[PDB]
Amino acid sequence: KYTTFQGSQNFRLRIVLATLSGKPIKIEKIRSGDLNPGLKDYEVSFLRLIESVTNGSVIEISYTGTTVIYRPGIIVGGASTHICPSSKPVGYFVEPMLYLAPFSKKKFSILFKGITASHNDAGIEAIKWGLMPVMEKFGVRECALHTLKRGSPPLGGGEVHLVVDSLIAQPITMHEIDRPIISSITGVAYSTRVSPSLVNRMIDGAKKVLKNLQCEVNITADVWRGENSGKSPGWGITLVAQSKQKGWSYFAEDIGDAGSIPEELGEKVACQLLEEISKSAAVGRNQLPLAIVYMVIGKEDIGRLRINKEQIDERFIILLRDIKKIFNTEVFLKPVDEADNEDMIATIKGIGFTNTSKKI
Template identity: 75%
Template sequence: MSAIPFQGHRNFRIRLVLATLAGKPIKITKIRSDDLNPGLRDHEVSFLRLLEAVTNGSIIKISYTGTTIEYSPGIIIGGSLTHNCPPTKPVGYFIEPMLYLAPFSKTKFSIVFKGITSSKEDAGLEAIKWGLLPVMEKFGVREAALHTLKRGAPPNGGGEVHLKVDHLIPQPLTMHALEMPKIAAIRGVAYCTRVSPSIVNRMIDAARGVLRGVGVEVNITADVWRGENSGKSPGFGLTLVAESKKGWRFIAEDIGGPGEVPEDIGVKVAYELLEEISKSAVVGRNQLQLALCYMVIGKEDIGRLLLNKEQIDENMIYLLRDIKKLFGTEVYFKDDDNENCLVATVKGVGFTNSSKKIA
């Protein structure tokens, strides 16, 4: 079977993950070939190692310059292991793609990730716990949990989290989500490590001030980490979750960067949550990739998901093209009664967990 060609460093993780699920070899060329520092980054190589560890029989070839890789996937075996994440990316960068593989593994996933636990670009712990795991639950993956053993703010990290997915399923359920969920409450976690506990209250007050107008219950928990479990660097962050009664959730999060005060973060995350709600239908933009991929690898049946027209952006088109290249499946968009919305319909490819074939 000849390798499916891809170019560039875009969607690096999801391409490898989808190739693993599809069982098709891929070849990615021109990875940062025009860059002053060409080729794969530390975290990308680290991700390849992780992928190799959770699969059996994968073959990964990296060219001398690191601008080309060939990946021939094996089967997903999972297991218990520890992964040390490089300081360039937080643990969320590595956990997120594992969520696509874990339910379809031969043995249960139980991986301890060590390193930085938060960043401005990648999924934080609460975003995974309250944003991504609930989406998986909608597709029939229960008993997935992320335990925070230690928090580790950037730049020095020192955090430790445990991802456990105990539910192995043959394939995800077919999704029919055509109704806009109503948000019943806004929850959140404001956390800090190695800084004054008053910081979390300042974030909470600022966020509440913005969200007071929407008229639902706002409940933000203060989570102050002290001592050995709080990592090597001072830091703070806020994750807000808007949840519906049916279990759909929208999330927004950020962490304090250099020169930012807690009030800024509180206000910013609150506004971003409102923005995310206004631009989404059933799932937020950061959950869309997971939801669409699970729909694609579902049963050979039509799944439907209500989308906001605002959610159709460049990233989504890149994702849909990658899906088509690997699975040959196209997502069709139908107009909805609500003129701001579209219904994405996709026929599952009839993927089956290779270790569950006898049934």
């Protein structure tokens, strides 16, 4: 009757994958042993968001809150506003909406309100220059995330408008069996309610680490001040390494806490960016789950994506098992014929998914 899961691990993914598959699921024993058991405030909010963009879905939260029954309906989208609790930033809620937006009866036009950055969730730039570019490669031609106002922690106060105008039957079959060549490094260093000197110093730090490279480095300085700057001081940097030949991008992001040296943050994100590149083959680790999910829901054909062995970590394994539990799909991994590197080709057969919600 119900495919049963355990714990709060991959809460968003399991709900999203259930919605795409249409298979009812049950998530039980959610933080049973904790002092405060059951769903968190932000988890409930995400469920509210899922209900807004869908019709016919049925959600039951147990009395103690440690069990969730989710019977998905059709994705319908539409225009709506969502208030994100301070516990999580907007990026926590925007990221799952990317998975569902391109296969909706009506365009997603959602205004997310709350904190716009955090230490553990996707930033505004990470979605704009890191994830939607992956979506565009898969057939989502037009999609935008407008930053009406930035809200830094703890008080937040930001506003972002997500618009996904493209509606597609399914993602195109992926065929990427090479290591993309990085052509240039870009980035955005933003700050709120503070002097411009911080953004300059962050750019100075990142440029020191990246100077030895052989590609151009140009980091944007986006200093926000005034009414649109939010309610608290904050500053963060996002660096993206761009491969113009095939439109692939690798990114690393982080934000600064009060009293931290801006230069150190710039250096750290630059160092992290290089770590991601060394560990990545076609897509970064943080972009990998989106790529795999989109391949699973393509046409009934064999899509190939090159992945480095460094990307096959605990997170990758759990993702595949959840996909197999819901979709019964198995990712076949074969070594590459080359010897210079130890990359592997992840071949995924699509399930024949199609966007039936859209009217003709």
